[PDB]
Amino acid sequence: INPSINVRPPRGGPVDTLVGAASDNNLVYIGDEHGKLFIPKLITESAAKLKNAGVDHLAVEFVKHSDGAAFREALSDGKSAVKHFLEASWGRHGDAWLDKVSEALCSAHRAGIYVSGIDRKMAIDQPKTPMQKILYMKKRLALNVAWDAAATREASAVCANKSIVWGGAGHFSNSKTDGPKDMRPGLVISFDLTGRGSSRINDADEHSHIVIAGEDN
Ligand SMILES: [Cl-]
Ligand SMILES: [Cl-]
Ligand SMILES: [Cl-]
Ligand SMILES: [Cl-]
Ligand SMILES: [K+]
Numbered sequence: 001i002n003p004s005i006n007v008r009p010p011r012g013g014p015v016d017t018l019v020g021a022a023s024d025n026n027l028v029y030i031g032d033e034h035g036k037l038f039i040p041k042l043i044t045e046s047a048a049k050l051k052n053a054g055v056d057h058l059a060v061e062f063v064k065h066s067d068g069a070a071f072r073e074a075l076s077d078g079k080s081a082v083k084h085f086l087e088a089s090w091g092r093h094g095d096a097w098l099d100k101v102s103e104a105l106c107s108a109h110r111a112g113i114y115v116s117g118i119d120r121k122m123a124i125d126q127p128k129t130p131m132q133k134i135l136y137m138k139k140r141l142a143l144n145v146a147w148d149a150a151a152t153r154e155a156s157a158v159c160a161n162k163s164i165v166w167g168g169a170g171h172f173s174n175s176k177t178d179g180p181k182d183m184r185p186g187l188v189i190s191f192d193l194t195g196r197g198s199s200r201i202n203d204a205d206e207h208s209h210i211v212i213a214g215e216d217n
Contacts, residue, residue, distance in 0.1 A: 002178050002185040007209045010199035014212050017199045018046050018189065021210060023053040026162050027186030029179065031169025031208060032061065035093040036193060038214035040100035043166070047104070047111040050164070057160035058108045059151035061167035062090050062101060063117025068154075071117060079106045116154035118147040118167065137170060141181065144171055148183040169207070176206035 001007065006024040010017035022028050032039055043058075063071045063086070074081040082102040091098050109115050120143055127136040147167060155163040165186070172180040172188045179185040190208035193216040202208045 001176060001209070004185050005179065005187050005209060007187065007201060009201060010210055010212070012199075014042050014199065014214060015046050015049065017210070017212055018042060019049045019053050021187050021189060022050050022055050022162055022164065025187040027179075027184055028162075028164045029172050029175070029183075029186050029188040030164060030166040031172045031188060031190045032167055033169060033191060033193070034090075035097045035217070036191070036214075037097055037100050037217055038193060039191060040097065040104040042212070042214070043104040044100070044107040047107040047113065050108075051111045051113055054161040055113060055164055057151075057155045057158060057163035058105075058113050058115050059118045059147075059154060059163060059165045060105065060115065061117075061119050061147070061171075062086055062105070063115075064089075064119045064121060065117045065146075065150035065154075066120070068117055071115075075105065075109045075115060079103050082106060114154065114158045114160070116150070118150040118165065119143070120146045120150070140168075141171055144180055144182040147171070148180075152184065173207040176202070176209060 008020055008024050011020040074085040079102045082105055083098055086098055105115050124136055124139055127133040151165050169190060175188040188208040190211050191214050192211045193214045197213050199213045200211050202211050
């Protein structure tokens with residue numbers, strides 16, 4: 001694997017593992033499972049420690065890069081403003097989850113982390129047939145190159161030491177060797193919400209480097 005991706009065996013707890021992964025890498029990808037409360041809660045609890053570890057930038061799928069100005073206004077108005085701003089595109093995945101996502105963005109912001117958007121508009125119909133489901137995901141993954149360009153631009157705009165990119169885990173598959181396709185090499189995190197396993201290095205597949213054990217809703 002790319003020597004810039006440093007894979008350290010998880011340091012116990014969920015917070016300790018995430019901070020340790022950011023401490024060991026200039027770029028970490030958090031593979032989101034939309035609707036799962038554990039992931040945004042984890043980021044909220046890690047915000048201050050991540051900042052201290054050198055994380056100055058958090059680039060998120062939930063905001064379109066083109067809406068940066070409007071989002072920064074919401075981020076200052078507070079959690080309630082961020083939720084209303086994200087609802088149009090992201091409320092579909094649950095009120096509680098959208099609330100926790102908003103809390104995580106706010107907690108990162110007030111911890112001194114620059115929060116910016118990576119997403120780009122792209123309309124696709126709901127997939128019903130087997131082939132539509134496949135084409136839909138392939139089309140979505142075509143945005144990786146643009147997600148990466150937006151995350152790069154905004155990291156540089158604030159001279160970030162380390163950055164985290166937070167987006168749908170499907171975009172970070174087959175990332176073991178060189179990180180996500182059409183994106184910069186980085187440590188990719190996935191989540192095991194079965195409550196069985198523990199945080200670990202991923203050996204089942206090459207869709208992430210480490211798996212953080214969490215709780216399902
Ligand atoms: Cl844009
Ligand atoms: Cl608040
Ligand atoms: Cl089609
Ligand atoms: Cl997706
Ligand atoms: K890559």
